[PDB]
Design a protein around this ligand. Structure first.
Ligand SMILES: Nc1ncnc2c1ncn2[C@@H]1O[C@H](COP(=O)(O)OP(=O)(O)O)[C@@H](O)[C@H]1O
Ligand SMILES: [Mg+2]
Ligand SMILES: [Zn+2]
Lengths: 478, 91, 410
């Protein structure tokens, strides 16, 4: 049905003129119109604009020639609103393109819309979007995850085939898990953060959602690589991932962290994960218990580091150069303090307060500096475990997709969604969430954490898993 | 943690909290501060704070790049005048 | 006098780079508001800083010229505060782990004695923009935001308003000789905040500190200090305690004033900018900058005294205004009569250019013309009396000495 087709199916059709870019966009546009009222994946749909851009698109040999792509609304797309799902940035028109958007555009991709998120990418459910909640296409009483809720969701309903999100502490993987889709956050430094509205600079990474491992491997290859506009982007050559996913490496090893046994899992998740591992064992993977003596400290560490960097990075939203400004004020001080109280959502305001505390002199040593040290302890656990094993596996999430309002009561209950996801951001490691089962009607994600720069292996295992378990065929909303 | 504390931190952060928020953020922040207080247990004398690996500091040649068009630089501005960003007067 | 003044200075020096500290926008004076500006230097969402290599190179050179220990690893830190001229809500500078530390400047005092003022630190940081007030509004130009600065902090080693000025003059001259900054207060290239306390003579304890901000010339720092020292001595001997505050200086009145606003400073919430890796400075690069260091004023001073046999009065003039020494040496090259050339340069040309209000870089009399004129005086082609008549018209016209000798008869 066209929107039902993968990028391989679409590429062959586009290369031989059997279809045009415009038709592709039209197809997904329809599926968008079918789904959007229920799902609410987008803040700013740009199918209209992509239609027009498609007419002038002609060179077919471009790696992403006719491909529609949704983009999270904390990644700048020039000339269109980048809201970060915030009141403080509604009506902010992006004056420049994120480096990844430049690279996709150059590769023929067609940006089809700006995707909903937790405000400033802080949250695990998308409920903190200042505008409206995005809903899980497999059960609209359920959350799609966060913060990249809309990017996961739209890939799930196939209102777009492939999608960009960002991952500070699980913001691609978790949503991938919840929406029954593939989602990867590459090694810290693999993809530029130029044009990515910064949350936690030392933790943020753009990543990719898709339904087929090749789709994800190609979009990632396109957007990855050194950027001169980003000091933290690595000068490391990008592997030819599209040619590499399909290969098979013999005698790989999987680590099951002993410390993860102590983690409260829903029985359905536990069952699905055990089966994922048994089935991988059958295919010849060696399965080993590993130790990460410090992982349990990941959450506390993250919820000191992330808020801290966030209070710093959000200092700039001030009513002076752009965005929202309060209407009533007697002073510059009031202008500042009113603009911000009114423009920022509650979770954001919470991490700002916590952050400016953790950086305050007198508390910096016991808070942020301490956390950055424990962070090295946690990274070192991984480097040592990677001496014995090739990837580390766990569930992506301790639970099945939860209900709206369920984790808004105590802010902390929201944080606990991240317990299996944050360790990879702390260690700067790549990590993928792939769908491993459907339990009580709901997707379950399996997570693989790889060594620095080893997205190849993560992707390879993802390709092998999909051949056994064809999750790309499970399409929600008919 | 005090009302005094909440107000002092919000001042630093330039948040003019509404009276509803001051009370909620008292409990929520207290809870979060108890929640994240796990790290004292660990010994970090003799642990280096985390930095990403790098061989040399990334630097850039001293050569001009085309600036942003002033129109685009100002377009988003709440108030502009004569090429300037406009804010209420400061002392 | 019973008391003693203790003075420390905090100097921000603008680096003569083409480009800003953390983006590729031009550093230039008097552009149209918000034209040399950037997603980066504008503190736009998503925009990342990239360190300027020449800014780094210049800051190392300046550190060495100030006799500092240059630290092979230093860290950019975020310094947070909210102000309309500071786009990101923070200034990127250095804190703990600055570039350079433990240096010194030598002052030559009128009485002939030489004194040292220690440099506590030199660190790299970016500038903020500039505000203009107009009615009930402030107008913000961010052209200057992100311009590279060296923040130079003195130990409280200065004892006298005159010493404070002399320090500032030497610092300027070292910066100029090293070629790192033009360092003229007039153009905002050098800022200076003054800190001062008093102390019973020969005491080792430190008195309560007053900070005087936005003093705009080397002369004004002397005047501000002159008064403030008097002010504090009055207070103390009247039985009062001197109170710790920031004050302002009015050039028109020559007085220092407390501020109407009891606004205390706020925690800067310092931490390493996570957009940047540590500044790692190879020993090999320090060595290379050390080996290729331009000549510095104290060195030049002894060299001229030797190479040309000038007096300490003469060489001092030539070294304190570098372009005068440069002129002299290019002239002495055309005609190897050093004694004759300094005479005619100092006693004649300099005063004639001053009167016409013209700098030595732009004088109609080129080093060739002075060397030529001094040739005619030495070789007895013309007399001193005639020589003084032709130099006046040389300045007036721009014609060679030989040109106007012919045009008017030998
Ligand atoms: N009692 C004092 N009298 C004069 N100058 C002082 C005194 N104390 C500090 N200073 C000067 O003030 C500047 C910095 O002061 P300091 O208190 O050391 O750092 P800061 O106040 O910037 O954190 C230095 O130039 C130092 O010499
Ligand atoms: Mg400074
Ligand atoms: Zn710039």
């Amino acid at each position: 049905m066209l929107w039902k087709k993968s990028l391989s199916e679409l590429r062959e059709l586009l290369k031989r003129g059997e279809v045009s870019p415009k038709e592709v966009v039209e197809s997904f546009y329809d599926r968008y119109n079918q789904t959007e009222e229920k799902v609410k994946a987008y803040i700013t749909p740009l199918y209209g604009k992509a239609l027009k851009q498609a007419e002038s698109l002609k060179e077919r040999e471009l790696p992403l020639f006719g491909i529609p792509i949704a983009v999270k609304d904390n990644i700048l797309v020039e000339g269109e609103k980048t809201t970060c799902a915030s009141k403080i940035l509604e009506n902010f028109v992006a004056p420049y393109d994120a480096t990844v958007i430049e690279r996709l555009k150059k590769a023929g991709a067609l940006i089809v819309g700006k995707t909903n998120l937790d405000e400033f990418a802080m949250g695990s459910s998308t409920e903190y979007s200042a505008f409206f909640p995005t809903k899980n296409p497999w059960d609209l009483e359920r959350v799609p995850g966060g913060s990249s809720g809309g990017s996961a969701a739209s890939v799930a309903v196939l209102s777009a085939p492939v999608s960009l999100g960002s991952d500070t502490g699980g913001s691609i993987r978790q949503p991938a898990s919840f929406c029954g889709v593939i989602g990867i956050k590459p090694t810290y430094g693999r993809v530029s953060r130029y044009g990515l509205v910064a949350f936690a600079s030392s933790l943020d990474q753009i990543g990719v959602f898709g339904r087929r491992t090749e789709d994800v491997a190609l979009v990632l290859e396109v957007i990855s690589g050194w950027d001169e506009k980003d000091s933290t982007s690595a000068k490391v050559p990008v592997p030819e991932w599209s040619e590499e996913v399909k290969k098979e490496v013999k005698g790989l090893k999987i680590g099951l962290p002993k410390e993860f046994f102590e983690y409260e899992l829903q029985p359905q998740v536990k069952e699905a994960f055990e089966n994922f591992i048994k089935e991988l064992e059958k295919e010849g993977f060696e399965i080993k218990e590993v130790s990460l003596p410090h992982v349990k400290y990941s959450i506390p560490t993250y919820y000191i580091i992330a808020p801290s960097e966030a209070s710093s990075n959000l200092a700039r939203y001030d009513g002076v150069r752009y965005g929202y400004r309060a209407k009533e004020y007697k002073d510059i001080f009031e202008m500042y303090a009113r603009t911000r109280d009114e423009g920022f959502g509650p979770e954001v305001k919470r991490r700002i307060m916590l952050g400016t505390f953790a950086l305050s002199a007198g508390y910096y040593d016991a808070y942020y500096l301490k956390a950055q040290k424990v962070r090295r302890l946690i990274t070192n656990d991984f480097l040592k475990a990677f001496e014995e094993v090739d990837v580390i596996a766990s569930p992506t999430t301790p639970t099945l997709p939860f209900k709206f309002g369920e984790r808004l009561e105590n802010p902390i209950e929201m944080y606990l969604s991240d317990i299996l996801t944050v360790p990879a951001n702390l260690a700067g490691l790549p990590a993928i969430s792939i769908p491993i089962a459907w339990k009580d009607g709901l997707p379950v994600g399996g997570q693989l954490i790889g060594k620095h720069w080893d997205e190849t292996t993560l992707l390879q295992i993802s390709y092998l898993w999909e051949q056994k378990f064809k999750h790309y065929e499970k399409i929600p909303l008919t | 943690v005090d009302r005094e504390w909440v107000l002092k931190i919000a001042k630093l952060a330039r948040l003019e909290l509404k009276e509803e928020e001051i009370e909620v953020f008292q409990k929520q922040l207290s809870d979060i501060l108890d929640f994240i207080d796990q790290l004292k247990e660990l010994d970090t004398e003799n642990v280096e704070p985390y930095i990403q690996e790098f061989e040399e500091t990334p630097m850039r040649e001293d050569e001009p790049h085309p600036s942003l068009d002033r129109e685009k630089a100002l377009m988003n501005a709440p108030e502009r005048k004569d090429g300037f960003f406009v804010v209420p007067r400061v002392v | 006098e019973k008391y003693e003044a203790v003075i420390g200075l905090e100097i921000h020096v603008q680096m003569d780079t083409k480009t800003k500290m953390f983006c590729g926008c031009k550093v230039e004076f008097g552009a149209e508001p918000n034209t040399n500006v950037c997603p980066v230097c504008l503190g736009m969402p998503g925009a990342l800083p990239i360190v300027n290599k020449r800014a780094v190179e210049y800051a190392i050179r300046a550190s060495l010229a100030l006799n500092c220990e240059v630290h092979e690893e230093s860290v950019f830190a975020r310094k947070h505060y909210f102000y309309p001229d500071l786009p990101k809500g923070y200034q990127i500078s250095q804190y703990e782990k600055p570039l350079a530390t433990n240096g010194w400047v030598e002052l030559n005092l009128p009485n002939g004695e030489k004194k040292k003022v220690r440099i506590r630190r030199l660190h790299i940081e970016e500038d903020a923009g500039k505000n203009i007030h107009e009615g009930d509004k402030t107008l913000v130009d961010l052209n200057r935001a992100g311009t590279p600065l060296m923040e130079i902090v003195t130990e409280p080693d200065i004892r006298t308003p005159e010493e404070a000025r002399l320090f500032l003059e030497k610092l300027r001259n070292i910066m100029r000789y090293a070629g790192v900054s033009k360092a003229d207060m007039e153009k905002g290239q050098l800022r200076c905040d003054i800190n001062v306390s008093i102390r019973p003579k020969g005491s080792k304890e430190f008195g309560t500190r007053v900070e005087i901000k936005n003093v705009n010339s080397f002369r004004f720092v002397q005047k501000a200090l002159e008064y403030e020292i008097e002010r504090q001595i009055n207070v103390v001997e009247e039985g009062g305690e001197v109170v710790q505050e920031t004050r302002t200086f009015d050039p028109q009145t020559g007085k220092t004033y407390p501020m109407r606003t009891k606004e205390e400073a706020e925690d800067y919430r310092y931490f390493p900018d996570p957009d940047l890796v540590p500044l790692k400075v190879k020993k090999e690069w320090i060595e290379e900058i050390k080996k290729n260091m331009p000549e510095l004023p104290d060195q030049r001073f002894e060299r001229l005294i030797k190479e040309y046999g000038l007096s300490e009065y003469e060489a001092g003039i030539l070294v304190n205004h570098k372009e005068v020494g440069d002129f002299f040496e290019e002239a002495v090259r055309h005609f190897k009569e050093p004694k004759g050339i300094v005479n005619w340069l100092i006693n004649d040309l300099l005063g004639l250019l001053r009167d016409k209000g013209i700098s030595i870089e732009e004088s109609p009399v080129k080093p060739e013309h002075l060397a030529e004129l001094v040739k005619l005086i030495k070789e007895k082609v013309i007399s001193t009396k005639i020589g003084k008549e032709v130099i006046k018209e040389m300045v007036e016209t721009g014609k060679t000495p030989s040109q106007i000798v012919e045009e008017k008869g030998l």
